[PDB]
Write a protein that binds this ligand. Structure first.
Ligand SMILES: *[C@@H]1O[C@H](CO)[C@@H](O[C@@H]2O[C@H](CO)[C@@H](O[C@@H]3O[C@H](CO[C@H]4O[C@H](CO[C@H]5O[C@H](CO)[C@@H](O)[C@H](O)[C@@H]5O)[C@@H](O)[C@H](O[C@H]5O[C@H](CO)[C@@H](O)[C@H](O)[C@@H]5O[C@H]5O[C@H](CO)[C@@H](O)[C@H](O)[C@@H]5O)[C@@H]4O)[C@@H](O)[C@H](O[C@H]4O[C@H](CO)[C@@H](O)[C@H](O)[C@@H]4O)[C@@H]3O)[C@H](O)[C@H]2NC(C)=O)[C@H](O)[C@H]1NC(C)=O
Ligand SMILES: *[C@@H]1O[C@H](CO)[C@@H](O[C@@H]2O[C@H](CO)[C@@H](O[C@@H]3O[C@H](CO[C@H]4O[C@H](CO)[C@@H](O)[C@H](O)[C@@H]4O)[C@@H](O)[C@H](O[C@H]4O[C@H](CO)[C@@H](O)[C@H](O)[C@@H]4O[C@H]4O[C@H](CO)[C@@H](O)[C@H](O)[C@@H]4O)[C@@H]3O)[C@H](O)[C@H]2NC(C)=O)[C@H](O)[C@H]1NC(C)=O
Ligand SMILES: *[C@@H]1O[C@H](CO)[C@@H](O[C@@H]2O[C@H](CO)[C@@H](O[C@@H]3O[C@H](CO[C@H]4O[C@H](CO)[C@@H](O)[C@H](O)[C@@H]4O)[C@@H](O)[C@H](O[C@H]4O[C@H](CO)[C@@H](O)[C@H](O)[C@@H]4O)[C@@H]3O)[C@H](O)[C@H]2NC(C)=O)[C@H](O)[C@H]1NC(C)=O
Ligand SMILES: *[C@@H]1O[C@H](CO[C@@H]2O[C@@H](C)[C@@H](O)[C@@H](O)[C@@H]2O)[C@@H](O[C@@H]2O[C@H](CO)[C@@H](O)[C@H](O)[C@H]2NC(C)=O)[C@H](O)[C@H]1NC(C)=O
Ligand SMILES: *[C@@H]1O[C@H](CO[C@@H]2O[C@@H](C)[C@@H](O)[C@@H](O)[C@@H]2O)[C@@H](O[C@@H]2O[C@H](CO)[C@@H](O)[C@H](O)[C@H]2NC(C)=O)[C@H](O)[C@H]1NC(C)=O
Ligand SMILES: *[C@@H]1O[C@H](CO[C@@H]2O[C@@H](C)[C@@H](O)[C@@H](O)[C@@H]2O)[C@@H](O[C@@H]2O[C@H](CO)[C@@H](O)[C@H](O)[C@H]2NC(C)=O)[C@H](O)[C@H]1NC(C)=O
Ligand SMILES: *[C@@H]1O[C@H](CO)[C@@H](O[C@@H]2O[C@H](CO)[C@@H](O)[C@H](O)[C@H]2NC(C)=O)[C@H](O)[C@H]1NC(C)=O
Ligand SMILES: *[C@@H]1O[C@H](CO)[C@@H](O[C@@H]2O[C@H](CO)[C@@H](O)[C@H](O)[C@H]2NC(C)=O)[C@H](O)[C@H]1NC(C)=O
Ligand SMILES: *[C@@H]1O[C@H](CO)[C@@H](O)[C@H](O)[C@H]1NC(C)=O
Ligand SMILES: *[C@@H]1O[C@H](CO)[C@@H](O)[C@H](O)[C@H]1NC(C)=O
Ligand SMILES: *[C@@H]1O[C@H](CO)[C@@H](O)[C@H](O)[C@H]1NC(C)=O
Ligand SMILES: *[C@@H]1O[C@H](CO)[C@@H](O)[C@H](O)[C@H]1NC(C)=O
Ligand SMILES: *[C@@H]1O[C@H](CO)[C@@H](O)[C@H](O)[C@H]1NC(C)=O
Ligand SMILES: *[C@@H]1O[C@H](CO)[C@@H](O)[C@H](O)[C@H]1NC(C)=O
Ligand SMILES: *[C@@H]1O[C@H](CO)[C@@H](O)[C@H](O)[C@H]1NC(C)=O
Ligand SMILES: *[C@@H]1O[C@H](CO)[C@@H](O)[C@H](O)[C@H]1NC(C)=O
Ligand SMILES: *[C@@H]1O[C@H](CO)[C@@H](O)[C@H](O)[C@H]1NC(C)=O
Ligand SMILES: *[C@@H]1O[C@H](CO)[C@@H](O)[C@H](O)[C@H]1NC(C)=O
Ligand SMILES: *[C@@H]1O[C@H](CO)[C@@H](O)[C@H](O)[C@H]1NC(C)=O
Ligand SMILES: *[C@@H]1O[C@H](CO)[C@@H](O)[C@H](O)[C@H]1NC(C)=O
Ligand SMILES: *[C@@H]1O[C@H](CO)[C@@H](O)[C@H](O)[C@H]1NC(C)=O
Ligand SMILES: *[C@@H]1O[C@H](CO)[C@@H](O)[C@H](O)[C@H]1NC(C)=O
Ligand SMILES: *[C@@H]1O[C@H](CO)[C@@H](O)[C@H](O)[C@H]1NC(C)=O
Ligand SMILES: *[C@@H]1O[C@H](CO)[C@@H](O)[C@H](O)[C@H]1NC(C)=O
Ligand SMILES: *[C@@H]1O[C@H](CO)[C@@H](O)[C@H](O)[C@H]1NC(C)=O
Lengths: 493, 142, 142, 142, 52
């Protein structure tokens, strides 16, 4: 009576694990080569279906992480290698001693000062201390003027060059220098080869969205209760392409996110305590970073004919520094409240027992905030900021860190260990002129880790890759499989 | 492209509304946009069209669009009822324990209850078509 | 390959003579010659078959031959009348202002006068086929 | 995949048993296994998918599977009898000197005796279908 | 059975630091060396790899 029959054109689907297409608006270099133009169609349809969503185990997020990394690698691959520069450089000894790369016992310093010296210093747009780059507590950038002998395309001829390094980028040989001209090498050369990131990478914004290939679609969880892991999402929305993603890399705070809403969301890994906290856009949180001074850039041709960009500054500018604006105190109070009320949190309900904290250890990769300003990476020391935003009673944090300020001192580093799991070191060319960047702050990347009903520690994290799981995350990629079977009586002849 | 398949999800199996032109439309929208990009990339980069990773990932997605379309057409022609909607094949349903609630269940819910039947059914549907073809072969020969 | 399509150009629309086997023939001539070359290149250069530019340009031309063939078949199946010559679909012509001079105008001249209609017509032709399919779906189910 | 075609070899032409689903099955088995590998290679090596030789040799084999399937379908549609088994076309056999022993000879032995006829026959079969199509064109137009 | 035939050789090699180098101990199978011949009345023969 009842035959299997075949129903073609069926409204049904299954999990897909395939590559997606990228589409963009910036087609000056990368976009034309790899992407389709952005169609501009961001519409979606709602479906009366229930579906399972996860952000840390998806195909949409795991392509964003791998694709951003891979497009970086194919951009630097053909650039000048700096192994010809891994030679002893002759560096000014005073500056190597002052910044601590080398040692001296002839400085016999002794300081007497007031210990009850903690200050509170606030800055805003209408202030001369910002315009003049001289906020209370800022010092000089730390740069070691070094000379070296380099050979160009003429082979049997060479010239001496003037290069000024940030201290962060030098090693410096120590012991029995009773004169001047210390002997220094680049910080990451000897275990590896440093390649220059020459094709304007990080000098502009990279934004793109993903599109499903024919026969495939993206489902999205459009709930407000979505917390990264949700086995049964009742509001499922279907579309062919994702929202536009900002492929920005930083630690501690994420900047310029697309998921900027008038709400605080916290995504938690289902099998872990790692979270991404979005921040409420209501408070207009913003970070404004500055690189004081006016840089000169001098191209150097090295042997193979490829060019290295040197930095012969021959001057002593103030430290790069960052200014935090917007209602940070209130945005942070909401983060604490959002954690207290969250479904996965069973800790303290006392918001005065929940605190922001730096990750521990002496490792700069986690203890400093790392941010990108148009091509130069900055590493910020944030104790002044954290003490301020939490209105912390400093009291015993050593004189220098006992201040409450809405700005932090920072330093420039040119030899960068990149963000993916590679261990690759690249050199970031200096930017000519002065730099300023004004970014929005959209997320706080942190682990929440408590062991009792008192002290919760929101520990700032350096796992920059997870930022992509806030940008996407709520997407699922599915395959439409429109052939069904079902018993019915309608047999042919 | 349109995604009219997913658009009726949640409507139940009966009156779900099946559309047979839907795969042609998803493929056609895809081919046109991808062809435009194939001709656009060479404007700036003609040499590295497949050497680097983006050109092999995009090749797999273009290949998938074609292979997927053809798998559906090949399976349908193996069954023979490519343009017959319900097809009305002669293979009996495996058992009475798996009967759909045509007016309550959705195709999405239903198909996941027969995943372990499809493995045996696909072969049976093809066998039924093969014997019908054998019968016609003999009629045409004699 | 033959180019019998272009061969009748200038004959007027009426009695133009339409051939339905013509795309199969252009594809078949193409595939055979390109396959022979695919097997011939490795005799001297097997490693660099797609790394360098010639292998990605030739890939785009081989891909185009396949995608083009399939776009025509997919569009025709969306309309449903793939092997019906005039097809005899049910969508009305948009207006009386655009009526061909069947015995004076050539298909080349005519098609360029309806480029702005095709954009709306393709969708209408598909919709008409979809409703016919819906009607048969219900007849087969009941 | 199954190789049911070769399985009946040696049975003679008459009662050889022809199967029309057989090419769909060889293609389908192929596409599924190759797709699984396309998604598996990137787990360890996503960048060098086509740069090195293995990815261009595998591309030629995946392309061949698709081109071969389509050549058979294109030739059959040119003749028009894609799903008609014996097809029953109107082109006369070239001469009485080449008549099969339907109950003694195998299709493998027979086809090698008509290789020099196929070159002329393919064209004739297409021409016969073309005129039938022309006749219907005029009936649909008038 | 006899001994494997190996020639202990020293050489000066430069690594990633460029302006610094070290002497290394390499023992070659005889099958892999060429060795310059004629008027060595002392020690330290002068050898190169067999196929370079
Ligand atoms: C399409 O995509 C979606 C989206 O990704 C897919 O959805 C996901 O599908 C997964 C399976 O394919 C699901 O994960 C699995 O869940 C099982 C059930 O977990 C619960 O029960 C566990 C124990 O219960 C036993 O006893 C009861 C009866 O008493 C039985 O009914 C059960 O079957 C068991 O026998 C319990 O331990 C689980 O809790 C722990 O795991 C969850 C993980 O989701 C955590 O969220 C919890 O906090 C908790 O974490 C502990 O363990 C993890 C290690 O995983 C540690 O890191 C933590 O610190 C902590 O200690 C649940 O209550 C699991 O049994 C199953 O695990 C087994 O199998 C996997 C392999 O699949 C092995 O790797 C494991 O080691 C183990 O053997 C697995 O976790 C996802 O939940 C589901 N996601 C969503 C959002 O729904 C969908 O399937 C895809 N569809 C297709 C067709 O592809
Ligand atoms: C978070 O989000 C914010 C907001 O989007 C983002 O800040 C903005 O970043 C973009 C990208 O870096 C900045 O846009 C560039 O700005 C510079 C500077 O312009 C100012 O100063 C000049 C002085 O000459 C004034 O004339 C000008 O009016 C502005 O005041 C521009 O120079 C850039 O344009 C270049 O590229 C164009 C490409 O079409 C060229 O046509 C143009 O001529 C420029 O060429 C220069 O750069 C080239 C490098 O490829 C070089 O080759 C050329 O020789 C030449 O040097 C561009 O408009 C924008 O100003 C930032 N805005 C703010 C408020 O900060 C943050 O960066 C982001 N943060 C993070 C962490 O993601
Ligand atoms: C975009 O995002 C912003 C920021 O989150 C939203 O602004 C908040 O909106 C809520 C809802 O209206 C505000 O909450 C209300 O505040 C009132 C004022 O309380 C003040 O005084 C108490 C001490 O007595 C302080 O603790 C408090 O912080 C304020 O300073 C309360 O009177 C309201 O009470 C109501 O709810 C309670 C239950 O909790 C009942 O018992 C009461 O009877 C009453 O019904 C309430 O708590 C919140 O203050 C706003 N924040 C800010 C910074 O302004 C925007 O609304 C959102 N935009 C959109 C469009 O949604
Ligand atoms: C920028 O700040 C000034 C001064 O405010 C003080 O210093 C700040 C750095 C911070 O510590 C504040 O809490 C201090 O109060 C603002 O000028 C004042 O504005 C208020 C009105 O809100 C007015 O009553 C005061 O008299 C002003 N003070 C002076 C010296 O004129 C200024 O408005 C802030 N700029 C912006 C854009 O908000
Ligand atoms: C690459 O160089 C580092 C550091 O260089 C040495 O230490 C500097 C302070 C300075 O004196 C340089 O001239 C020296 O060459 C090497 O790291 C050291 O390794 C030794 C073991 O051999 C260890 O005892 C030291 O504590 C390490 N010092 C630091 C600062 O890390 C590193 O091993 C070199 N890598 C290679 C492949 O040679
Ligand atoms: C590569 O080297 C071989 C051998 O090196 C020479 O002979 C050794 C025994 C030793 O004395 C080395 O220092 C010498 O440099 C060269 O082979 C010889 O070629 C000459 C012709 O110039 C011929 O008369 C000798 O009989 C060859 N000897 C042997 C052992 O084959 C070879 O030509 C060199 N190749 C190049 C490109 O220079
Ligand atoms: C980022 O914001 C700063 C202000 O904080 C901008 O700098 C001002 O630019 C105007 C116009 O040239 C000057 O009149 C002001 O004096 C500048 N302020 C200071 C403190 O120097 C800056 O231009 C903004 N963005 C970028 C990319 O530079
Ligand atoms: C996230 O961290 C909390 C805090 O340590 C974990 O909570 C503990 O879970 C164990 C069971 O695995 C209980 O016996 C403890 O009593 C819980 N501690 C507290 C303070 O409540 C939680 O399991 C962690 N989450 C994941 C996914 O591992
Ligand atoms: C997603 O949710 C918002 C409310 O937060 C609603 O306005 C929007 O229409 C929903 N999207 C769809 C496709 O229904
Ligand atoms: C992610 O989910 C899949 C099932 O879809 C599972 O097989 C895989 O192990 C999960 N990965 C993780 C993070 O364990
Ligand atoms: C470095 O700069 C000084 C000026 O401060 C100049 O006198 C000197 O010649 C320069 N040296 C080199 C190697 O360029
Ligand atoms: C410095 O010189 C003393 C001898 O006066 C020697 O013992 C010591 O090892 C030397 N140190 C270095 C780093 O060369
Ligand atoms: C400093 O360098 C100069 C050469 O420029 C040299 O003559 C002088 O002796 C050095 N100073 C010391 C303390 O050795
Ligand atoms: C889907 O939900 C809407 C309400 O948001 C309802 O009006 C509609 O009838 C539902 N459709 C189906 C098929 O359940
Ligand atoms: C019989 O029905 C059960 C469901 O109760 C199903 O698991 C089983 O596979 C079915 N057997 C056959 C031959 O279809
Ligand atoms: C749907 O559920 C109702 C009970 O709520 C039942 O009476 C009815 O028969 C079910 N429909 C079908 C098609 O089984
Ligand atoms: C094409 O031109 C030739 C003269 O060169 C003429 O004999 C023939 O009839 C013309 N055909 C058409 C369709 O106009
Ligand atoms: C009506 O005819 C005019 C030609 O005069 C044409 O431009 C227009 O697009 C036609 N409108 C429709 C709906 O076909
Ligand atoms: C062709 O043009 C003539 C005028 O030269 C006209 O009378 C005739 O009707 C036209 N043919 C058609 C089909 O309109
Ligand atoms: C093939 O050979 C076997 C013996 O090995 C025989 O039984 C069978 O009938 C033969 N089949 C044909 C078609 O000749
Ligand atoms: C006639 O038959 C002979 C075989 O004896 C064959 O070689 C020849 O090609 C055939 N001619 C035609 C037109 O088929
Ligand atoms: C097969 O061979 C026999 C002779 O052994 C002959 O009599 C018979 O006619 C042949 N069969 C056919 C179909 O020609
Ligand atoms: C070679 O080995 C000897 C020990 O047999 C050791 O004394 C000598 O220093 C080593 N030479 C080099 C260059 O490593
Ligand atoms: C060795 O020295 C003699 C001179 O005493 C010279 O004639 C001969 O050529 C030299 N042989 C070699 C291999 O240098
Ligand atoms: C052997 O080498 C030593 C140096 O290690 C040297 O002093 C000695 O003279 C050499 N032997 C002969 C025979 O030249």
């Amino acid at each position: 009576t009842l035959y299997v029959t075949v129903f073609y054109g069926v409204p049904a689907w299954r999990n897909a694990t395939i590559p997606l297409f990228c589409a963009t608006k910036n087609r000056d270099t990368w976009g034309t080569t790899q992407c389709l133009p952005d169609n501009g169609d961001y519409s979606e349809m709602a479906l009366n279906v229930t579906e399972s969503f996860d952000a840390w185990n998806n195909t949409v997020t795991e392509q964003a992480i791998e694709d951003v990394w891979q497009l970086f690698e194919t951009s630097i691959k053909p650039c000048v290698k700096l192994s010809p520069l891994c030679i002893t450089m002759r560096c000014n000894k005073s500056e190597t001693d002052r910044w601590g790369l080398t040692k001296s016992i002839t400085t016999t310093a002794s300081t007497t000062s007031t210990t009850a010296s903690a200050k509170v210093d606030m800055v805003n747009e209408t202030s001369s201390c910002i315009a003049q780059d001289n906020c209370t507590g800022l010092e000089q950038e730390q740069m070691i003027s070094c000379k070296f002998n380099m050979t160009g395309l003429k082979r049997d001829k060479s010239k001496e060059y003037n290069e000024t390094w940030y201290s962060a980028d030098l090693v410096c040989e120590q012991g029995n220098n009773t004169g001047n001209e210390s002997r220094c090498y680049m910080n990451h050369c000897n275990t590896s080869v440093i390649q220059e990131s020459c094709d304007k990478h990080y000098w502009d914004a990279i934004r793109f969205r993903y599109c499903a290939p024919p026969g495939y679609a993206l489902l999205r969880c459009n709930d407000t209760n979505y917390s990264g892991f949700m086995p049964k999402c009742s509001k499922v929305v279907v579309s062919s392409c994702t929202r536009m993603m900002e492929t920005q890399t930083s630690t501690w705070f994420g900047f310029n996110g697309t998921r900027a809403e008038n709400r605080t969301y916290i995504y938690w890994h289902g099998r872990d305590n790692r979270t991404i906290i979005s921040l409420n856009k209501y408070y207009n949180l913003t970070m404004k970073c500055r690189r004081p001074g006016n840089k000169t850039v001098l191209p150097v041709t090295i042997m193979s004919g490829l060019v290295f960009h040197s930095q012969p500054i021959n001057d002593r500018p103030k430290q790069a520094w960052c200014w935090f604006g917007g209602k940070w105190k209130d945005a942070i109070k909401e983060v604490k409240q959002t954690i207290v009320k969250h479904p996965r949190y069973t800790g303290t309900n006392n918001t005065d027992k929940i605190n922001l904290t730096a990750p521990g250890g002496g490792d700069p990769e986690v203890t400093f905030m790392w941010t990108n300003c148009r091509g130069e990476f900055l590493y910020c020391k944030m104790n002044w900021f954290l003490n301020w935003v939490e209105d912390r009673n400093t009291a015993n944090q050593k004189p220098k860190e006992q201040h409450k300020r809405n700005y932090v001192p920072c330093h420039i580093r040119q030899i960068i260990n990149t963000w993916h799991k590679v261990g690759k070191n690249v050199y970031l060319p200096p930017r000519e002129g002065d730099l300023t960047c004004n970014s929005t702050v959209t997320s706080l990347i942190a682990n929440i880790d408590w062991i009792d009903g008192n002290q919760t520690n929101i520990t700032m994290s350096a796992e920059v890759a997870e930022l992509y799981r806030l940008e996407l995350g709520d997407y699922k990629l599915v395959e439409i499989t429109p052939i069904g079977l079902a018993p019915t009586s309608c047999k042919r002849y | 492209g349109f995604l009219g398949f997913l658009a009726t999800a949640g409507s139940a199996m009966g009156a779900a509304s099946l559309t047979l032109t839907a795969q042609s439309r998803t493929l056609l929208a895809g081919i046109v946009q991808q062809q435009q990009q194939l001709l656009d990339v060479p404007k700036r980069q003609q040499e590295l069209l497949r050497l680097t990773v983006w050109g092999t990932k995009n090749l797999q997605t273009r290949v998938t669009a074609i292979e997927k379309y053809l798998k559906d057409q090949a399976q349908l022609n193996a069954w023979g009822c490519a343009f017959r909607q319900v097809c009305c094949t002669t293979v009996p349903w495996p058992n009475a324990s798996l009967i759909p609630k045509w007016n309550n269940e959705t195709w999405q819910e239903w198909e996941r209850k027969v995943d372990f039947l499809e493995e045996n059914i696909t072969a049976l549907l093809e066998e039924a078509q093969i014997q019908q073809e054998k019968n016609m072969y003999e009629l045409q020969k004699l």
